[PDB]
Design a protein around this ligand. Sequence first.
Ligand SMILES: Cc1cc2nc3c(=O)[nH]c(=O)nc-3n(C[C@H](O)[C@H](O)[C@H](O)COP(=O)(O)OP(=O)(O)OC[C@H]3O[C@@H](n4cnc5c(N)ncnc54)[C@H](O)[C@@H]3O)c2cc1C
Ligand SMILES: *[C@@H]1O[C@H](CO)[C@@H](O[C@@H]2O[C@H](CO)[C@@H](O)[C@H](O)[C@H]2NC(C)=O)[C@H](O)[C@H]1NC(C)=O
Ligand SMILES: *[C@@H]1O[C@H](CO)[C@@H](O)[C@H](O)[C@H]1NC(C)=O
Ligand SMILES: *[C@@H]1O[C@H](CO)[C@@H](O)[C@H](O)[C@H]1NC(C)=O
Ligand SMILES: *[C@@H]1O[C@H](CO)[C@@H](O)[C@H](O)[C@H]1NC(C)=O
Ligand SMILES: *[C@@H]1O[C@H](CO)[C@@H](O)[C@H](O)[C@H]1NC(C)=O
Ligand SMILES: *[C@@H]1O[C@H](CO)[C@@H](O)[C@H](O)[C@H]1NC(C)=O
Length: 521
Amino acid sequence: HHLANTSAHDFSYLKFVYNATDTSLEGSYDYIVIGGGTSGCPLAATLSEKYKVLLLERGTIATEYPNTLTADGFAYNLQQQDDGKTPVERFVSEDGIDNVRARILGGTTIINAGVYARANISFYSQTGIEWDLDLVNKTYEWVEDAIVVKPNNQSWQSVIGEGFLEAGILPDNGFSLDHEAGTRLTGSTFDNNGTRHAADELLNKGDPNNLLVAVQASVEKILFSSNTSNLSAIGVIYTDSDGNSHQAFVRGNGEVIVSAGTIGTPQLLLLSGVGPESYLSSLNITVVQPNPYVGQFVYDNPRNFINILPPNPIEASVVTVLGIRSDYYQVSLSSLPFSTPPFSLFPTTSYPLPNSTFAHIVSQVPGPLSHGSVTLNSSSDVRIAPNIKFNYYSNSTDLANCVSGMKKLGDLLRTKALEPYKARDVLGIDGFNYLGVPLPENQTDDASFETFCLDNVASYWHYHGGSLVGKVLDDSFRVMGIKALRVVDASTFPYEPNSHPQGFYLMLGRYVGLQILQERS
Ligand SMILES: Cc1cc2nc3c(=O)[nH]c(=O)nc-3n(C[C@H](O)[C@H](O)[C@H](O)COP(=O)(O)OP(=O)(O)OC[C@H]3O[C@@H](n4cnc5c(N)ncnc54)[C@H](O)[C@@H]3O)c2cc1C
Ligand SMILES: *[C@@H]1O[C@H](CO)[C@@H](O[C@@H]2O[C@H](CO)[C@@H](O)[C@H](O)[C@H]2NC(C)=O)[C@H](O)[C@H]1NC(C)=O
Ligand SMILES: *[C@@H]1O[C@H](CO)[C@@H](O)[C@H](O)[C@H]1NC(C)=O
Ligand SMILES: *[C@@H]1O[C@H](CO)[C@@H](O)[C@H](O)[C@H]1NC(C)=O
Ligand SMILES: *[C@@H]1O[C@H](CO)[C@@H](O)[C@H](O)[C@H]1NC(C)=O
Ligand SMILES: *[C@@H]1O[C@H](CO)[C@@H](O)[C@H](O)[C@H]1NC(C)=O
Ligand SMILES: *[C@@H]1O[C@H](CO)[C@@H](O)[C@H](O)[C@H]1NC(C)=O
């Protein structure tokens, strides 16, 4: 009933968006939210219902990059070179796996693949947080009313769904937003006219008299009270696009919330002296609050895949059909050929280029159990990306789950559903033409599947952790030991909420905003 309709991207909120060069944005606020992204935008909009809010985003507005605003533009933004101003910031983990993060108002919802899902209902009790489950669901509906649709039919997504069901990914769940075992059509933040809807549009739910947004605002330090006896965050330093510095503060019972993402939040905490004592001391960063876990327990769920090249063209699609098991989450994207690769779609730049249409058939490892860290490259410059290592497949359970997922992709390639897409009508799956590495020969050779998993891993782009609840934060998302400082974004949990987490983190931004308001009343 509540889902959104086909509609233009709503930029009405630009009336309270300003360049960070404007010094009249400096001053005192009730709340400062750092990072105008997936959690940050609904958080800021929610707080602004009652209080004065400054939202600071390092990127510009999405209208500057029109290919972020359509389903057809997804590949373009990844193909585009990173000049330091583009909405996609490229990086390579220390593992050697290419990756991207967002740099734009709206955050990663402006560049992502649009898949919308609610969290696995078991996630809430898994965390042990005392969730208000009725409020969680009302908050999902608030997001979904604004930016989520039921997708129309797409031929390739329907093929893949028939294949998942035939391969035993049961039951058939029809259309459902919920992360449950089986095959389903889920929601999308692309509407059925191809228009991208995103977290920035949730700013339209803020009070235009109370919410201010500064763009091209690079937040480089959190400021703290000089009296440490009662240590509190008091404000931030940020620089504008011309390089000049600015300061903003919170007042009274207000708070600073960091929503700068898995990469940005631990980086800013470390730069600000919140983190592991001997590490920060080794950089001659004065320790404000020692905590061994800042930038620790950083996770990237592996993506493994094969690419088939059908002998007749298939239609490009956005991902809407999901095949879910407890030990693997599977989808498929169909794509036009390209001569410039979308960066990080494949794990390195030396990957073969497709000359015809292809299906990217994908499996995601849950968890994962392997983890690494975010550490500083520069001890002063927040615009220099931190070092990030994920330690893919260091935990053997992850590898075992990849093996299981790849065997299930073999089952999928053997379905009647996928048979019309073979180049040769032979009995085996070698009748497909493959871009890149095909699935290993014999399913009895687990060592061949393990080698395939290890050598051909890519990022699923769903990385998380680095400021975990229970390590850096309490159950109210407050940074332990520091007053008036919280963290709300994907740095907060060590496991996925589901196969596609934007829906959870959109919800979380508003949910924690409501908790902050209730606490204050
Ligand atoms: C290519 C790609 C595709 C994806 N597709 C999907 C999908 O289809 N479905 C799904 O559910 N999930 C998808 N995801 C994952 C999901 O979108 C992200 O996990 C989620 O959006 C992260 O939200 P966040 O609030 O933690 O971070 P973000 O949304 O990235 O927000 C962080 C914001 O903080 C800003 N920032 C950072 N540092 C600073 C600073 N110092 N000062 C000021 N601002 C700062 C950043 O510019 C950014 O806007 C995808 C991810 C990627 C990379
Ligand atoms: C939803 O999340 C729950 C909780 O994490 C997952 O439950 C686990 O399921 C596996 C396989 O059944 C078990 O080995 C674990 O012991 C379960 N843990 C708990 C705490 O129950 C469940 O797999 C997830 N469901 C899906 C479809 O991903
Ligand atoms: C902010 O102003 C500077 C000039 O002072 C300009 O170069 C930059 O593009 C502006 N940014 C936005 C988002 O308007
Ligand atoms: C919340 O919604 C889910 C479906 O997403 C439903 O299964 C669950 O029962 C709801 N919980 C409450 C407390 O209403
Ligand atoms: C830190 O400062 C001390 C001097 O106080 C110096 O000896 C040491 O080399 C410095 N280390 C770094 C990493 O700057
Ligand atoms: C793999 O992860 C699980 C969960 O954290 C842990 O119990 C196990 O010890 C890990 N294995 C290794 C080798 O670290
Ligand atoms: C900074 O990053 C580059 C490339 O990511 C790396 O080669 C270099 O070693 C890093 N430097 C520090 C001091 O971490």
